Amino acid sequence: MASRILLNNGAKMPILGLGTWKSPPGQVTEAVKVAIDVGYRHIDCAHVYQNENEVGVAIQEKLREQVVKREELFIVSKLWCTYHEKGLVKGACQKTLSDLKLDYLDLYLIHWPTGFKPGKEFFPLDESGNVVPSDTNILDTWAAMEELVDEGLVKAIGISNFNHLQVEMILNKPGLKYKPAVNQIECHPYLTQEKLIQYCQSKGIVVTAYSPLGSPDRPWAKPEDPSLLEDPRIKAIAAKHNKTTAQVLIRFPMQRNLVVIPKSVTPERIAENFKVFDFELSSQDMTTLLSYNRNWRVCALLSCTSHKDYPFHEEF
Ligand SMILES: NC(=O)c1ccc[n+]([C@@H]2O[C@H](COP(=O)([O-])OP(=O)(O)OC[C@H]3O[C@@H](n4cnc5c(N)ncnc54)[C@H](OP(=O)(O)O)[C@@H]3O)[C@@H](O)[C@H]2O)c1
């Protein structure tokens, strides 16, 4: 297991990164500092997480400390849905750059294919509680992303939560200048994603797996929901290999040629989670983990199920 995967922009991306969704602002600076100290070189961020300033304090401090060089870090952020308009993309990217203490991002993603009405509210509502769409489509937002590459603000651009028909729409865009480098999607043993992965990889698009542990701290968790970290079938594979269940859940996507971004703010788990380059799951282990699929999503964007570009009506 090599630590980096080659993207279709010619740059290399670390296959393990640290997630930051739900990381409290008073904990995430120390989480990112610890992560860099114990070997992480990739941090997954987003403006909608409301903690980029605090992530940036950690990055800046480790660059100033000369723990790492900027060229050795791979920092990812995402354009939120209320900024899909031509005239707002650059300022959204630049706010993220300012917050993160950076002069460029390694990768900038369209967070979801759905554009929303611009304004202060991240989920603007009509009176009856529906999210209010933007009329701007994925293709014009993609052209705005391409301009960020050509202005030096981002090294790579990509997409997130795009279904295969939406990836195809990008790839078939008239006058396409840069292909997406990455599609970041939910992926774990309960949502194994073979078709969408198979499609993206066949096109040279690297897939990043989010919520690889099943997001036990997701805000809408219900007790009756399945639990990867407690699944005795997965705990058995981990015991066989003398690893934790989380380490198996992180190694799994790595052996599918995916990038994976487990989140923690607990120092011991941050270190735990990185110690996944010294063991191999067998093919039988991999097939067995894949067999647990049940099409279960942490992130189903339920307020947006009538948006024209809602991604999860399509089989994949
Ligand atoms: N593109 C998108 O739309 C999108 C959507 C969802 C997620 N993401 C990205 O993917 C990242 C990861 O997904 P996620 O945050 O949903 O969830 P996750 O990484 O699947 O799970 C995070 C949870 O697992 C716990 N945990 C971490 N390591 C553990 C270990 N070794 N043992 C036991 N528990 C452990 C964490 O607790 P503590 O933190 O308390 O240690 C936290 O409660 C996000 O943070 C975000 O960066 C992107």
Author numbering: 0 to 315
Q: Which sentences did the original study use to describe this structure?
A:
The key step in this pathway is the reduction of glucose to sorbitol catalyzed by aldose reductase (hAR, AKR1B1), a member of the NAD(P)H-dependent aldo-keto reductase superfamily. The inhibition of hAR would therefore block the polyol pathway, counteracting significantly the unbalanced conditions caused by intracellular oxidative stress typical of diabetes. According to the results presented here, the activated form differs structurally from the native form by the replacement of the Cys298 residue by Ser298 and, to a lesser extent, by Ala298.
The absorbed dose per each data set in the exposed region was 0.03 MGy. Signs of specific damage were not observed in the catalytic tetrad Tyr48, Lys77, His110 and Asp4342, which consistently agrees with the similar experimental kcat values measured with the non-irradiated and irradiated enzyme. The distances of the Sγ-Cys298 atom to the closest atom of the studied inhibitors can thus be compared, and are shown to be always above 3 Å. The native form is therefore sterically compatible with the inhibitors, as expected since they were designed against it as a target.
